[PDB]
Write a structure and sequence with these properties.
part of a larger assembly; 4 chains; A alpha+beta; B mainly alpha; C mainly alpha; D alpha+beta; B: mainly alpha; four-stranded parallel sheet; 8 helices; 4 strands; elongated; D: alpha+beta; four-stranded antiparallel sheet; three-stranded antiparallel sheet; 4 helices; RNA-binding; Ribosomal_uS2_bac/mit/plastid (chain B)
Chain lengths: 159, 224, 211, 156
RNA sequence: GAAAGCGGCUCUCUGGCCUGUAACUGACACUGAGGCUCGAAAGCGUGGGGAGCAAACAGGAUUAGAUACCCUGGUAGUCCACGCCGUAAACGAUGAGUGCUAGAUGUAGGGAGCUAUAAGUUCUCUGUAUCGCAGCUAACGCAAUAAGCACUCCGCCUGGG
RNA sequence: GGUGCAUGGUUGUCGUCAGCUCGUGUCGUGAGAUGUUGGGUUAAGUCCCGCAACGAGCGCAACCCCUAUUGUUAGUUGCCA
C-alpha cells in the first residue's frame, strides 16, 4: 500500500518474518481501499522470552487503530496479532460497510376506604378541602360536608 | 377498665378497609361489607380490645419507656397528645429504616437535634452571615424531618405501638430484632399473628386513633 | 499525578522558610543557606531534626533554628548546637546564631512520627500496625484530618503496597489545607520505603495577606 | 467475650471498572463450651477488621442446645443446600469423633463425643448452617415429659 | 382431543367428559415391561390437480467476494385420493394413578338456591391463567391444573468428548 | 554503565471526570444489594424525594491569586487637573 514504518525497537530487523508481516498486511491489502499508513513497532527482551511485544499502527484514510500485543514467541506475536488484525477487520466489516444499520381530572375519588358522614367533618379537615370526598359509611351511598359561609358545619348533600 | 364499642361506633374504629386484598386468616372478626367499607359488630372485638385494656396497664406499671407511631395521615396529632400524656416521645413522621441497631444514627440525631441546636440557641446563630441559613436548612429542616424525639429516651422502649404495620413493615422487623413487644391498630389489610394485639381500626375517620390511643396512653398515665 | 499540599503552601500561601529579603544575592545567600540547612539536618546525626529557618538579616544573618526537644538535642546542657554553631562559624565565617525552640508536641509532627516510624521500619516493624499505631496516636491527639503513605520494595518487589488507616478529612483539592506533611525514602537491601504524613490539626492556611 | 475458634479467611472479590478490588471475608465460631455456639463473618479488607466483623456477627445467632450431660438429645440432621450433617449420639467421652468444621462445634457446645460425618458438601458456609439446623431439630426429654402431655418414664 | 392437532357453510355416524345421581353391579380398581395402535414436519410410491407461494438454479445489486439477506423470476415441493418412514424444543427440556390443603384471583357449562313488579347475587365440578400461605430448591422459581406433603405402575440418569 | 514488568521519589495520561468510595446497619447461603435507587436542576452524588437506611469522605462546586466599582495613601526617580 502507500507507506509503512517498520521498526524493531529492541532487536535488529530481519525480513523473512518481516516479509510475513508484509504479506499478512498484504491481506490488509486484500481488505484495503487506501492503505494510507502503517507502522511496525516491536519489542522483545531478555530472560528467555518472558514476553513478546509487537505493534503496528493503522492510520487508514478514515480510521486509525494500533496493535501492541503479545505472545511468548515474537513469531507467534506476528502470527496471532496479525491474525488479530484480520479478525479486527472482521470486526470492521459492519463498522466500515454498514453505514446503514437498517381542567378537572376525569377520574373517580382518589381515596380508597369509605368514611361516614360524621367523619366528613374530619375528612374535610383531613386533606384540606371544604368538601369531603368520602363514600358515606353511615348514609347508604355518598355524602359530603361542605362549609357554609355563615361559619357552621355545611353539607354539600344531595341527601 | 373498658371504654367499649357502645361508644366506639361512629368515630371509625371497628371497620375494615375497601373490600379487596383482605386476609383469609383474620375473617372470624370482620364480617360484613357495604358502601365501600367493612363494618365490625360487637361480638369479639369488645373483649379483644379489653385484652389491650388489661395489658397496656400491665406493661405501663413497671416503669418502662413506651413508644407510639402515628405516621398515617389522620393519626399524627393523637401520637403527639398521647406522647405528651404518656410521657415518652412520639413518632409522627414517615418512618426511617435503620433506627434501633445503628447507634450513631439516632445518637447523632440527638446531638444535632439538640446539641448542635444549642449553637442555634446560643451565640453562633447571630455571629455567622447568610451561609448559616442553609445550615439552618439542615437544622430548621433536617431536625423536624429527622426529628425522632428520641433524646428523652436512653434505652429501648417496652411497647412499639403503630397505626399500621401493613404500611409500616420496617420497624415491625426492627422490633422483632432484639425482643421489644409491640402494640398496633391492625385492620383487615394485615395478618397480625406476629403483632401482639388485634385492634381492628383504620385511620382516616374522625376519632379512632383518638379513642384507642387515648385510653392506651391513659393506661400509661396510671402506669406512671 | 497528585498535588503536593505544602508544595502549594510553603512558598507564598505559607510564608517562607527563607523568611527574609535581599536585593541582589537573594538566591545566593538563600541557596547557600539551604546548603547550610542541609548541614544542620545532617549534623544533627545524633539528634532529632524538627524544622529550621536560617535567615539573612540587617546584621547580614540571623539563623533561625528549631529543635524537637531542648533537653536532648541542644547538648549535654545546650552546647551541641552552640559548639556546632561555632563550628558553623568555622564553616561559613559569620556571626552565627542559635535558636533553642522545641517544636511543640512532635507526636503531631510529620517529621518525627513518620520518620521515627520509618526508622522503626528500619528496625522491621509490622507496618500496618505501625500505621494504626502512629496515626492512632496523633488522631488520638487531635489531627482533624490525618493520613500517611508507605511504599513497597520488599527484597525485590513491586512499587508500593496499600496503606491502611490512611483516613481523615484532608480536603487537598480545596484551598483550606493546614497540613504538617512529610515524606521519606528508607534505603535498604530489601528496597526503599516512602513515608508521607498528612497531619491536619489546623484548618486554615493562607499566610499571604497584610495591611 | 466467648471461647474462640476461627474457621477460615475466605476468598471473594469486588470487580471494579478499571480492575480488581481485593475483597476480604472470614468466618469464625465462638461460644463457651456449654451448648452455646455462635459464628461470625468478616466482609472487610484486612484480618483484624474481619475479627471486628467476626465478633459483630459472632455476637449474635448464639443459642443453646439442650445438652443432656455432654451428649446429644438424639440423632439429628442438618440440611441447608449441600451442608448435610447427620449427628449421632453414641458412647461418649472417648474421642471427639467429628469433622473439622464441627469438632469446633461440639468443643464450643461441650459434647463429650459425637459420631458426625457429613454428606452433601464440605462447604463450610453450609456446614455451619446445617450445624445450626442439626441443633435445631432437637426436641428434649423435658418436653416429651411436658409438651407431649404426659411425664413419660423413658426419661421421667 | 392422550397428544399430534383441530375454524366458510350444511348433512352423515362418531367417540369423550362434566353436572346431577345409589336405579344397579358389588372393588369389577390403578396401572403397565412385552406386544399393539396413533402420530408432527418434510420426503419417498402411484395417479391427478395444477392459482398463489416457494427448494434447485438463473439474472441484478452486494462487496474483496456472494453460491446468502433484497429484487426479478423460477424447478422440485406445497393441494387431492392412495401407501411409508417413526424421527420434531414431543415442550412446560415438568411420566401415570389417586389423597391432603391459606387465599387474591380468569372463564365455560351444568347443578342448586338467588335478586324480583323486568335487575343480580351465593354455593357446587371438571377447565385453563396471574399473584402469592405453608412447604419448597444451587438459585431461578412452583404452589391447586404444587418444582409441598404420601403411596402403586413404569421408565431414565451416572464426568466430559 | 547495565538492570525503571527489580529500585524509591518525581513523573504524563485518561479526566478539570462527576463520578468514585468507605463506616454503621439491614437483607441475601454467598459474593452481592445500602449510601449510589430518588424529583427536577446543575457544571456538580448540585439538592431532594420516596427510600434500609444513616453518616463520613474523595470531590467540580467552597476557600488562593489576577483583572473588572469605590473610599483610606498624595509626590518618589513616576501624576500637573
Amino acid at each position: 500500500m502507500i507507506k509503512f514504518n517498520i521498526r524493531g525497537e529492541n532487536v535488529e530487523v530481519t525480513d523473512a518474518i518481516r516479509a510475513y508481516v508484509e504479506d499478512k498486511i498484504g491481506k490488509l491489502d486484500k481488505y484495503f481501499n487506501d492503505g494510507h499508513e502503517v507502522t511496525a513497532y516491536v519489542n522483545l527482551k531478555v530472560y528467555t522470552e518472558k514476553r513478546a511485544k509487537v505493534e503496528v499502527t493503522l492510520p487508514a484514510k478514515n480510521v486509525t487503530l494500533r496493535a501492541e500485543d503479545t505472545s511468548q514467541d515474537m513469531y507467534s506475536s506476528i502470527d496471532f496479532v496479525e491474525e488479530k488484525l484480520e479478525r479486527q477487520i472482521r470486526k470492521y466489516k459492519t463498522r466500515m460497510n454498514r453505514k446503514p444499520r437498517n381542567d378537572i381530572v376525569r377520574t373517580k375519588h382518589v381515596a380508597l376506604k369509605p368514611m361516614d358522614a360524621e367523619e366528613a367533618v374530619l375528612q374535610m379537615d383531613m386533606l384540606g378541602h371544604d368538601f369531603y370526598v368520602f363514600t358515606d359509611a353511615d348514609s347508604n351511598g355518598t355524602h359530603v360536608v361542605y362549609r357554609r359561609t355563615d361559619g357552621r358545619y355545611g353539607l354539600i348533600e344531595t341527601e | 377498665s373498658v371504654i367499649s364499642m357502645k361508644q366506639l361506633l361512629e368515630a371509625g374504629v371497628h371497620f375494615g378497609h375497601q373490600t379487596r386484598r383482605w386476609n383469609p386468616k383474620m375473617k372470624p372478626y370482620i364480617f360484613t361489607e357495604r358502601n365501600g367499607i367493612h363494618v365490625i359488630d360487637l361480638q369479639k372485638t369488645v373483649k379483644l380490645v379489653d385484652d389491650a385494656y388489661n395489658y397496656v396497664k400491665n406493661a405501663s406499671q413497671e416503669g418502662a419507656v413506651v413508644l407510639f407511631v402515628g405516621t398515617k395521615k389522620q393519626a399524627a396529632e393523637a401520637v403527639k397528645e398521647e406522647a405528651l400524656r404518656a410521657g415518652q416521645y412520639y413518632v409522627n413522621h414517615r418512618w426511617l429504616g435503620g433506627m434501633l441497631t445503628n447507634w450513631n444514627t439516632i445518637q447523632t440525631r440527638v446531638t444535632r437535634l439538640k446539641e448542635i441546636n444549642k449553637m442555634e440557641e446560643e451565640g453562633t446563630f447571630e455571629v455567622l452571615p447568610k451561609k448559616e441559613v442553609v445550615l439552618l436548612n439542615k437544622e430548621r429542616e433536617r431536625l423536624e424531618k429527622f426529628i425522632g424525639g428520641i433524646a428523652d429516651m436512653p434505652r429501648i422502649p417496652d411497647v412499639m405501638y403503630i397505626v399500621d404495620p401493613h404500611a409500616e413493615q420496617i420497624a415491625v422487623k426492627e422490633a422483632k430484632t432484639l425482643g421489644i413487644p409491640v402494640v398496633a391498630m391492625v385492620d383487615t389489610n394485615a395478618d397480625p399473628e406476629p403483632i401482639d394485639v388485634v385492634i381492628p381500626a383504620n385511620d382516616d375517620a374522625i376519632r379512632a386513633v383518638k379513642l384507642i390511643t387515648a385510653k392506651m396512653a391513659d393506661a400509661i398515665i396510671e402506669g406512671r | 499525578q497528585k498535588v503536593h499540599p505544602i508544595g502549594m503552601r510553603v512558598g507564598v500561601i505559607r510564608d517562607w522558610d527563607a523568611k527574609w529579603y535581599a536585593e541582589k544575592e537573594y538566591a545566593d545567600y538563600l541557596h547557600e543557606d539551604l546548603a547550610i540547612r542541609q548541614l544542620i539536618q545532617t549534623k544533627l546525626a545524633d539528634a532529632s531534626v524538627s524544622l529550621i529557618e536560617t535567615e539573612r538579616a540587617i546584621n547580614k544573618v540571623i539563623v533561625t533554628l528549631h529543635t524537637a526537644k531542648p533537653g536532648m538535642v541542644i547538648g549535654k546542657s545546650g552546647a551541641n548546637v552552640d559548639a556546632l554553631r561555632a563550628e558553623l562559624n568555622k564553616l561559613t565565617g559569620k556571626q552565627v546564631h542559635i535558636n533553642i525552640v522545641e517544636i511543640k508536641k512532635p507526636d503531631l509532627d510529620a517529621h518525627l512520627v513518620g520518620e521515627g516510624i520509618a526508622k522503626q521500619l528500619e528496625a522491621r516493624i509490622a507496618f500496618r500496625r505501625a500505621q494504626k499505631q502512629a496515626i492512632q496516636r496523633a488522631m488520638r491527639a487531635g489531627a482533624k484530618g490525618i493520613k500517611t503513605q508507605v511504599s513497597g520494595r520488599l527484597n525485590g518487589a513491586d512499587i508500593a503496597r496499600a496503606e491502611g488507616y490512611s483516613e481523615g478529612t484532608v480536603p487537598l483539592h480545596t484551598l483550606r489545607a493546614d497540613i504538617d506533611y512529610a515524606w521519606e525514602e528508607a534505603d535498604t537491601t530489601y528496597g526503599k520505603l516512602g513515608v508521607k504524613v498528612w497531619i491536619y490539626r489546623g484548618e486554615v492556611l493562607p499566610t499571604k495577606k497584610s495591611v | 467475650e466467648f471461647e474462640e475458634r476461627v474457621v477460615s479467611i475466605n476468598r471473594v472479590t469486588k470487580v471494579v471498572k478499571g480492575g480488581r478490588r481485593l475483597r476480604f471475608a472470614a468466618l469464625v465460631v465462638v461460644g463457651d463450651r456449654n451448648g452455646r455456639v455462635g459464628f461470625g463473618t468478616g466482609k472487610a479488607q484486612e484480618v483484624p477488621e474481619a475479627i471486628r466483623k467476626a465478633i459483630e456477627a459472632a455476637k449474635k445467632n448464639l443459642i443453646t442446645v439442650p445438652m443432656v450431660g455432654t451428649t446429644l438429645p438424639h440423632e439429628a440432621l442438618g440440611v441447608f443446600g449441600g451442608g448435610k450433617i447427620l449427628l449421632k449420639p453414641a458412647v461418649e467421652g472417648a474421642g471427639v469423633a467429628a469433622g473439622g468444621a464441627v469438632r469446633a462445634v461440639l468443643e464450643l457446645a461441650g459434647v463429650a463425643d459425637v459420631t458426625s460425618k457429613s454428606l452433601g458438601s464440605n462447604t463450610p458456609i453450609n456446614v455451619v448452617r446445617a450445624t445450626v439446623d442439626g441443633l435445631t431439630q432437637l426436641k428434649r426429654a423435658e418436653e416429651v415429659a411436658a409438651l407431649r402431655g404426659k411425664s413419660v418414664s423413658d426419661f421421667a
